[PDB]
Design a protein around this ligand. Structure first.
Ligand SMILES: CC1=CC(=O)CC(C)(C)[C@@]1(O)/C=C/C(C)=C\C(=O)O
Ligand SMILES: [Cl-]
Ligand SMILES: [Cl-]
Ligand SMILES: [Cl-]
Ligand SMILES: [Cl-]
Ligand SMILES: [Cl-]
Ligand SMILES: [Cl-]
Ligand SMILES: [Mn+2]
Ligand SMILES: [Mn+2]
Ligand SMILES: [Mn+2]
Ligand SMILES: [Mn+2]
Lengths: 187, 313
């Protein structure tokens, strides 16, 4: 049984002194069991906003459009209590190698500010995608900033390679983290 | 030069309409010093009227394409106003004009160029649509002298001259050898993810908008300055909702045969009323081309401008 090893490499965008603290949550949250012909990656984004308002955005499992790209519309299932086990039907915008996606909210921990979702259907080539977003505050001489960490694991589709899948999956996650920056620093 | 055109722009099996087009007859007064050079033959000929056609295949949303429809031709008119202040070469001169015009528009979409106000004050500075929204553009200027095509993306303009279809633009696809090299010489990557795609996302190498993929996806267009010929039959502008299911040669011939067929059954229409509005025979061919695209199975937005280049038939 193999496992991701993202604790071994300081991800782009974080200081050594921040990773000393972040290296702990990486092994706690952002570590997956690796099945054959799969792949994974870990991304991080410094946000100049308090880790409570960052989390306040990130947790809105029913408004992913607010802090994510490529969403045309998202609908839940009427009776929605934002509880683990919930689902949401997404429609993507045009011009993508994707058109819909069904997502299920697996982790929702307000005590540790960690958000986990597994994609369970839809029309796209990222089968068995699971992602974790954990928010981490910091303080440096009264300057309250946030480091967000997102990882994922996904099956590698037929025809493509691990680095294609990382390069495509990474590209979207960076973009989405880059927007979350702009939205949080705006509040 | 009496402009003869027809248009059909349909949503088809798409849930959203993101194609847009614009026809503007008699729009510009191109100075003759920008087309040919005086020889031994008309002192009264000092300017020459140009008609504008553009098709815009948006992706990710409609607001960039709609903007191109509403703004691109005024952008171009302004750039030709700046060259009327003076202060071969014509090919490069048109190259610059359209390069500037598309760059001006791209910047306004992105929110990096102020957009003019109607109260004559500070030019509004704001992005026109989101970061992920974009749009092709293929644009034609037709005057009695020349045809000038300016292209940015995978919409296409095909000229039917004699019996040979002649594309007036090359599709800006990410797997095109020169574009693949250009996107890597910029630091970008192209991968095969349900088609050649920049970073696995956008299936085109050039566009208007698409801020989030600057400076990989650029708005620099290929421009063709083509002298007209008595054997020119028609000029077609379309989005790829047609070209994906229909060969250039075939499209062009069907257009001609449909125009001819119309004139055979009804003859010509009153010369007084020719010019203002769509030409029935051009309309009938666009109508025929679009219904073929659907029944061949195109599941995309489809937009076609058919332009008859024969003085008479
Ligand atoms: C934009 C898009 C394109 C695809 O091809 C896959 C999928 C449809 C799942 C996706 O919504 C990707 C979502 C990703 C990578 C991450 C997330 O949401 O945390
Ligand atoms: Cl659709
Ligand atoms: Cl839009
Ligand atoms: Cl110039
Ligand atoms: Cl390729
Ligand atoms: Cl026919
Ligand atoms: Cl007929
Ligand atoms: Mn489109
Ligand atoms: Mn651009
Ligand atoms: Mn296509
Ligand atoms: Mn299209």
């Amino acid at each position: 049984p193999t496992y991701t090893t993202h604790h071994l490499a300081i991800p782009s965008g974080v200081t050594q002194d921040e990773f000393d603290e972040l290296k702990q949550s990486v092994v706690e949250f952002h570590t997956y069991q690796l099945s054959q012909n799969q792949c994974s990656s870990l991304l991080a984004q410094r946000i100049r906003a308090p880790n409570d308002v960052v989390w306040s955005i990130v947790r809105r499992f029913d408004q992913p459009q607010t802090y994510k790209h490529f969403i045309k519309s998202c609908s839940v299932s009427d009776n929605f209590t934002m509880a683990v086990g919930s689902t949401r039907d997404v429609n993507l915008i045009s011009g993508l190698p994707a058109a819909t996606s069904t997502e299920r909210l697996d982790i929702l921990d307000d005590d540790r500010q960690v958000l986990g979702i597994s994609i369970i259907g839809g029309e796209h080539r990222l089968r068995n995608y699971r992602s974790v977003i954990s928010v981490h505050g910091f303080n440096r001489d009264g300057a309250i900033c946030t480091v967000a960490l997102e990882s994922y694991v996904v099956d590698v589709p037929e025809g493509n390679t691990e680095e294609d899948t990382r390069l495509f999956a990474d590209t979207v996650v960076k973009l989405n983290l880059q927007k979350l920056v702009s939205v949080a620093e705006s509040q | 030069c009496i402009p003869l055109w027809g248009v059909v722009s349909i949503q088809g099996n798409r849930s959203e309409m993101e194609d847009a087009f614009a026809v503007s007859p008699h729009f510009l007064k191109l100075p003759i010093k920008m087309l040919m050079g005086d020889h031994e033959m008309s002192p009264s000929l000092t300017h020459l009227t140009g008609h504008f056609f553009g098709v815009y295949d948006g992706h990710g949303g409609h607001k960039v394409a709609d903007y191109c429809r509403d703004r691109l031709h005024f952008a171009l008119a302004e750039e030709i106003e700046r060259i009327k202040d003076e202060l071969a070469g014509r090919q490069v001169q048109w190259d610059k004009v359209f390069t500037s015009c598309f760059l001006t528009v791209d910047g306004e979409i992105e929110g990096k160029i102020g957009r003019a106000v109607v109260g004559s004050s500070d030019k509004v500075l704001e992005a026109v649509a989101s970061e992920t929204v974009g749009s092709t553009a293929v644009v034609a200027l037709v005057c009695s002298s020349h045809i000038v095509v300016s292209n940015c993306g995978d919409s296409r303009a095909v000229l039917f001259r004699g019996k040979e279809a002649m594309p007036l633009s090359v599709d800006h696809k990410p797997d095109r050898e020169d574009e693949y090299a250009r996107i890597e010489n910029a630091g970008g990557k192209v991968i095969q993810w349900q088609g050649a795609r920049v970073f696995g996302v956008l299936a085109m190498s050039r566009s208007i908008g698409d801020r989030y993929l600057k400076p990989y996806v650029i708005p620099e267009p290929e421009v063709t300055f083509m002298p007209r010929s008595r054997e020119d039959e028609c000029l077609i502008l379309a989005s790829d909702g047609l070209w994906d299911v229909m060969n250039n040669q075939e499209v062009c011939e069907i257009a001609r045969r449909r125009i001819l067929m119309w004139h055979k059954k009804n003859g010509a229409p009153p010369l007084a009323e020719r010019g203002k509005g769509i030409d029935p025979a051009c309309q009938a061919a666009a109508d025929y081309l679009s219904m073929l695209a659907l029944q061949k199975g195109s599941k995309d937005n489809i937009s076609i401008i058919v332009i008859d280049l024969k003085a008479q038939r």
